[PDB]
Design an enzyme around this catalytic site. Structure first.
Site, mmCIF file in Angstrom:
data_model
loop_
_atom_site.group_PDB
_atom_site.id
_atom_site.type_symbol
_atom_site.label_atom_id
_atom_site.label_comp_id
_atom_site.label_asym_id
_atom_site.label_seq_id
_atom_site.Cartn_x
_atom_site.Cartn_y
_atom_site.Cartn_z
ATOM 1 N N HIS A 43 0.844 -1.179 0.000
ATOM 2 C CA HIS A 43 0.000 0.000 0.000
ATOM 3 C C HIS A 43 0.888 1.241 0.000
ATOM 4 O O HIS A 43 0.509 2.304 -0.664
ATOM 5 C CB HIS A 43 -0.990 -0.074 1.179
ATOM 6 C CG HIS A 43 -1.945 -1.229 1.073
ATOM 7 N ND1 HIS A 43 -3.313 -1.064 1.014
ATOM 8 C CD2 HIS A 43 -1.726 -2.561 0.962
ATOM 9 C CE1 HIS A 43 -3.899 -2.241 0.896
ATOM 10 N NE2 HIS A 43 -2.958 -3.169 0.864
ATOM 11 N N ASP B 4 -5.997 5.122 1.843
ATOM 12 C CA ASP B 4 -6.374 3.816 1.436
ATOM 13 C C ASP B 4 -7.793 3.492 1.952
ATOM 14 O O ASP B 4 -8.036 3.434 3.143
ATOM 15 C CB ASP B 4 -5.421 2.771 2.025
ATOM 16 C CG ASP B 4 -5.666 1.360 1.448
ATOM 17 O OD1 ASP B 4 -6.802 1.034 1.021
ATOM 18 O OD2 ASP B 4 -4.700 0.583 1.393
HETATM 19 O O1 U2F Z 1 11.853 -8.912 -1.178
HETATM 20 C C1 U2F Z 1 10.980 -8.089 -1.506
HETATM 21 C C2 U2F Z 1 9.584 -8.388 -1.448
HETATM 22 C C3 U2F Z 1 8.661 -7.395 -1.856
HETATM 23 N N1 U2F Z 1 9.159 -6.206 -2.258
HETATM 24 C C4 U2F Z 1 8.251 -5.151 -2.652
HETATM 25 O O2 U2F Z 1 7.105 -5.233 -1.794
HETATM 26 C C5 U2F Z 1 5.882 -5.083 -2.575
HETATM 27 C C6 U2F Z 1 5.082 -6.394 -2.543
HETATM 28 O O3 U2F Z 1 3.756 -6.028 -3.013
HETATM 29 P P1 U2F Z 1 2.749 -7.107 -3.659
HETATM 30 O O4 U2F Z 1 1.503 -6.476 -4.106
HETATM 31 O O5 U2F Z 1 3.459 -7.913 -4.707
HETATM 32 O O6 U2F Z 1 2.726 -8.076 -2.396
HETATM 33 P P2 U2F Z 1 1.907 -7.758 -1.064
HETATM 34 O O7 U2F Z 1 1.953 -6.292 -0.496
HETATM 35 O O8 U2F Z 1 1.880 -9.097 -0.392
HETATM 36 O O9 U2F Z 1 0.508 -7.425 -1.730
HETATM 37 C C7 U2F Z 1 -0.677 -7.188 -0.969
HETATM 38 O O10 U2F Z 1 -1.259 -5.907 -1.244
HETATM 39 C C8 U2F Z 1 -1.505 -5.598 -2.622
HETATM 40 C C9 U2F Z 1 -2.069 -4.163 -2.692
HETATM 41 O O11 U2F Z 1 -3.382 -4.050 -2.080
HETATM 42 C C10 U2F Z 1 -2.440 -6.660 -3.232
HETATM 43 O O12 U2F Z 1 -2.580 -6.423 -4.643
HETATM 44 C C11 U2F Z 1 -1.959 -8.111 -2.905
HETATM 45 O O13 U2F Z 1 -2.911 -9.108 -3.312
HETATM 46 C C12 U2F Z 1 -1.630 -8.297 -1.406
HETATM 47 F F1 U2F Z 1 -0.986 -9.487 -1.165
HETATM 48 C C13 U2F Z 1 6.349 -4.796 -4.010
HETATM 49 O O14 U2F Z 1 6.556 -3.398 -4.229
HETATM 50 C C14 U2F Z 1 7.738 -5.420 -4.065
HETATM 51 O O15 U2F Z 1 8.561 -4.810 -5.012
HETATM 52 C C15 U2F Z 1 10.557 -5.984 -2.303
HETATM 53 O O16 U2F Z 1 11.026 -4.908 -2.688
HETATM 54 N N2 U2F Z 1 11.416 -6.917 -1.949
HETATM 55 C C1 7E0 Z 2 -3.934 -8.081 7.107
HETATM 56 C C2 7E0 Z 2 -4.270 -7.268 5.889
HETATM 57 C C3 7E0 Z 2 -3.353 -7.084 4.917
HETATM 58 C C4 7E0 Z 2 -3.580 -6.272 3.638
HETATM 59 O O1 7E0 Z 2 -2.995 -7.003 2.518
HETATM 60 C C5 7E0 Z 2 -3.816 -8.001 1.892
HETATM 61 C C6 7E0 Z 2 -4.390 -7.417 0.614
HETATM 62 C C7 7E0 Z 2 -5.691 -6.731 1.030
HETATM 63 C C8 7E0 Z 2 -5.826 -6.881 2.556
HETATM 64 C C9 7E0 Z 2 -7.318 -7.031 2.838
HETATM 65 C C10 7E0 Z 2 -5.064 -5.836 3.424
HETATM 66 C C11 7E0 Z 2 -5.044 -4.434 2.798
HETATM 67 C C12 7E0 Z 2 -5.705 -5.549 4.791
HETATM 68 C C13 7E0 Z 2 -5.658 -6.682 5.802
HETATM 69 C C14 7E0 Z 2 -5.071 -8.175 2.702
HETATM 70 C C15 7E0 Z 2 -5.433 -9.393 3.538
HETATM 71 O O2 7E0 Z 2 -5.825 -9.269 2.177
#
Ligand code: U2F
Ligand code: 7E0
Length: 440
Positions: free
Chosen positions: A13, A106
């Site tokens: 985020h 957000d």
């Molecule tokens: O070793 C690392 C590991 C990660 N990163 C950075 O962390 C970010 C990972 O974001 P990403 O959307 O892929 O994973 P995450 O936040 O689990 O996503 C959640 O949030 C997203 C946004 O709401 C959603 O789309 C998703 O489904 C959720 F899981 C991304 O910018 C990577 O480049 C890094 O620099 N080095």
């Molecule tokens: C724990 C949590 C993590 C975040 O990353 C993930 C993507 C959306 C999400 C609802 C949220 C923004 C909010 C809740 C999450 C659990 O699914």
């Protein structure tokens, strides 16, 4: 002053919102990152041009997420304490002579809106998921679709020209297709949209050439303006780098397009057997690989598997993922297809092997495979398990397939449209400049 309030702790985020803030600063605005006291205490600040400010989720000393692993429970506490401390911050800031011109937030923090609005501060929702998923949640919030959402509802959206792909049962977003599994995340996903129409602006981290029907619908239905991909301008070839991280030196020694990057994100956890299938799959593919296994997960990794990975892999706790994706050695990305990851792959022209877990990942994975054509999705066996043979088959399908060139052609094509969108005169750049003007 422009306040920026991502979901706290959630790196998926925070980066995008920070990048949007750098572009605001380029146009003369002054951005402030708002975050929890805990994260502040335990993280370096972003630095210029950002100020930082803090609110509390209740756990200023401990991680509250760790403390309250039940998600509904955490959200409830974040809301009570965040709403109170955000109200206090909006007043303390005005009293210090820095009155907030707008709060960019957000909408997984729905309460932020009401607090800003009651303090007289303009609000701009910042959606960090793709239009295709956003809009489905929106349709539920607007009571145009009942829970649960079905492939039949999705097919109506496709037939109406709103979604560009027909989503099957494994492609619909599980938070609304199987709400029982995750009650709090269902409600959070949907409540993003409750009161959105009272916002001054609504913004989404995507670009319209990528999801043209979905972005067009989000705009005419919710006034959503595409402002992405919200990445550092260098990766977007936008004129108006190289680190010392050890894994980059390993990567410098590999041949061009030879390496598979493997990451399942910051949130999801894998159990021992699942790590076993994933890592054996990687070893069995015979490719070099950079496998990101987080510190809080690495104790699940056996010594044996770890030794097997030494032949031509490297396991690390974190990498500079943008830098890796831009590196000449990187040939494909085996990813959970979180949105941030997927956009980073697209901006670097890196083909994907998608292994979605939940949230927006199943839908994203379907776009990757069917409409964008930039990769393939792993097929789980009959009982929901990912096998090492499937992991291996997909790696080899992307890197040595008869369609190897199709995945690469599409990823390159989409890389160029992503850069165009964020360059001067592009579709996303224009919406950024409009917002900037509005608040200056
Ligand atoms: O070793 C690392 C590991 C990660 N990163 C950075 O962390 C970010 C990972 O974001 P990403 O959307 O892929 O994973 P995450 O936040 O689990 O996503 C959640 O949030 C997203 C946004 O709401 C959603 O789309 C998703 O489904 C959720 F899981 C991304 O910018 C990577 O480049 C890094 O620099 N080095
Ligand atoms: C724990 C949590 C993590 C975040 O990353 C993930 C993507 C959306 C999400 C609802 C949220 C923004 C909010 C809740 C999450 C659990 O699914």
């Amino acid at each position: 002053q422009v306040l920026l309030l991502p979901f706290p702790a959630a790196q998926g985020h925070t980066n995008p919102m920070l990048q949007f803030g750098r572009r605001l600063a380029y146009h003369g605005l002054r951005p402030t990152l708002v975050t929890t006291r805990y994260v502040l205490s335990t993280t370096p600040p972003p630095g210029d041009p950002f100020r930082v400010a803090a609110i509390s989720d209740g756990f200023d000393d401990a991680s509250g997420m760790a403390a309250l692993p039940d998600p509904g429970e955490y959200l409830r506490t974040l809301e009570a304490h965040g709403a109170r401390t955000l109200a206090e911050l909006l007043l303390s800031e005005a009293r210090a002579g820095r009155p907030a011109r707008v709060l960019v937030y957000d909408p997984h923090l729905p309460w932020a809106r009401r607090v800003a609005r009651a303090a007289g501060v303009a609000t701009a929702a910042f959606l960090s998921q793709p239009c295709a998923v956003d809009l489905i949640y929106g349709e539920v919030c607007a009571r145009r679709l009942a829970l649960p959402v079905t492939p039949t509802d999705a097919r109506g959206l496709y037939a109406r020209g709103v979604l560009g792909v027909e989503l099957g049962p494994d492609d619909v977003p599980p938070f609304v297709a199987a709400p029982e599994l995750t009650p709090a995340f269902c409600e959070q996903s949907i409540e993003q949209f409750a009161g959105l129409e009272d916002d001054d602006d609504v913004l989404v981290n995507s670009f319209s050439d990528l999801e043209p029907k979905e972005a067009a619908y989000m705009e005419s239905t919710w006034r959503a303006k595409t402002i992405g991909p919200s990445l550092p301008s260098f990766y977007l070839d936008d004129g108006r780098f190289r680190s010392t991280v050890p894994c980059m030196e390993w990567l410098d020694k590999q041949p061009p397009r030879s390496v598979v990057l493997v990451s399942y994100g910051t949130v999801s956890t894998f159990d021992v057997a699942k790590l076993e299938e994933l890592g054996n799959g990687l070893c069995n593919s015979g490719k070099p690989f950079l496998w990101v296994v987080r510190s809080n997960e690495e104790h699940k990794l056996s010594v044996q598997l770890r030794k097997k990975c030494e032949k031509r892999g490297l396991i690390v706790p974190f990498c500079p993922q943008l830098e890796v994706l831009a590196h000449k050695a990187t040939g494909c990305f085996l990813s959970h297809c979180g949105w941030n990851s997927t956009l980073e792959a697209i901006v670097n022209g890196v083909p994907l092997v998608a292994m979605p877990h939940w949230a927006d990942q199943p839908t994203i994975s379907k776009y990757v495979e069917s409409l964008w054509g930039m990769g393939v999705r792993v097929q789980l066996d009959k009982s929901g398990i990912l096998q090492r043979e499937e992991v291996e088959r997909c790696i080899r399908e992307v890197m040595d397939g008869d369609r190897k060139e199709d995945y690469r052609r599409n990823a390159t094509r989409l890389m160029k449209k992503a850069k165009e969108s964020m360059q001067e005169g592009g579709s996303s750049d224009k919406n950024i400049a409009e917002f900037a003007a509005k608040y200056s």
